[PDB]
Structure 1
């Protein structure tokens, strides 16, 4: 019974059958296809630096009705263009075009977060200092 072989000389069948059914797993495939290297915008890295191209306003999806104040960024090491959310209020004033921001993942390991559609990234540092410091008036943005 039970649909799998059980004989003592049948380890090859069980081992090859486990191998074939491992591919249905989401993260086993990405570990063995190298999807992080080839397909992901960051090259399988926690962080990446970029260059700001434009300020964006993205409508929040239902049932929220705000404007999310994100930016469009082009990375240095890849040249790819990603959209990154700019956190709590006034920070879009602290970011401008061509500030060489630093980016991180947005929490959900390659997925969008909250009511923002199609943004997988956030800004951490702008002009090389912080956003927490600039928001809390602990540091000052360099004159550029």
Structure 2
């Protein structure tokens, strides 16, 4: 995207919130809308229990995903100014 390394976005809708199996990639993927350009791209939350911190209409930083749905390119790094792995590790509370 763009010319930058990380993009910001709005979480439009957590697609695959009603998927059955817990660590499905359709369960982990989230449709976000990038601020700078306006397009809706899909991004992976790194973990299914870590999906619960991503709420609707939250400013979300996302980066590339460099390594079950092959081709979803982005991963959610920060949510509302706090790092998502820190939220998952219970280091910080999310400012809303």
Place the TM-score, normalised by the shorter chain, in its bin: 0.7 to 0.9
- CA 1:129–1:62: 2 relative to 1, 3 Å: closer
- CA 1:65–1:59: 2 relative to 1, 3 Å: farther
For 1:1-52, what per-residue CA distance to the aligned partner results, in whole angstroms no more than 9, with x for missing partners?
xxxxxxxxxxxxxxxxxxxxxxxxxxxxxxxxxxxxxxxxx11321100001
Larger RCO, structure (CA 8 Å, separation 6 or more) = 2
- The question of whether the paired residues in 2 share the 8 Å contact of 1:50 and 1:75 is answered with yes
Deviation at 1:126, TM superposition (A): 0.4
Unaligned runs of 5+ in 1: 1-41, 109-114
- Tell me which structure has the larger Cα radius of gyration: 1
* Aligned-pair Cα RMSD in Å: 3.4
Number of corresponding residues: 96
The structure where helix makes up a greater share of residues is 1
Runs of 4 or more off by more than 3 Å in structure 1?
Answer: 58-68
Give the TM-score taking structure 2 as reference length: 0.83
The structure where strand makes up a greater share of residues is 2
Deviation at 1:56, TM superposition (A): 1.4
Give the TM-score taking structure 1 as reference length: 0.57
